[PDB]
């Protein structure tokens, strides 16, 4: 689930570029 701490840092990882670039969809680790 999402809380305020998780949301504020989520904004960082989904942005992989400046304005006009596609957002990151996922970053999943699986072994």
């Amino acid at each position: 689930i999402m809380n305020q701490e998780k949301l504020a840092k989520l904004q960082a990882q989904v942005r992989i570029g400046g304005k006009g670039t596609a957002r990151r969809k996922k970053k999943v680790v699986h072994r």
Binding site: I16, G20, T21, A22, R24, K25, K26, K27, V28, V29, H30
Partner: protein, 63 residues
């Protein structure tokens, strides 16, 4: 460390040029372990390699 092979293999698998290949700048160590196209496919599935969208060339001005 040096990810020329990974970029080349990701371009081959994604069927796009090396322009559109995006490697995760934070997961450099994980991508560096990828030496085969199966591992490239696994990284693409797991989100560490992304095909960047095509650069916009609008025709609204032309229309």
């Amino acid at each position: 460390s040096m990810l020329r092979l990974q970029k080349r293999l990701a371009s081959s698998v994604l069927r796009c040029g090396k322009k559109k290949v995006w490697l995760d700048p934070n997961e450099t160590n994980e991508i560096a372990n990828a030496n085969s196209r199966q591992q490239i496919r696994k990284l693409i599935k797991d989100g560490l390699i992304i095909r960047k969208p095509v650069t916009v060339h609008s025709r609204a001005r032309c229309r």
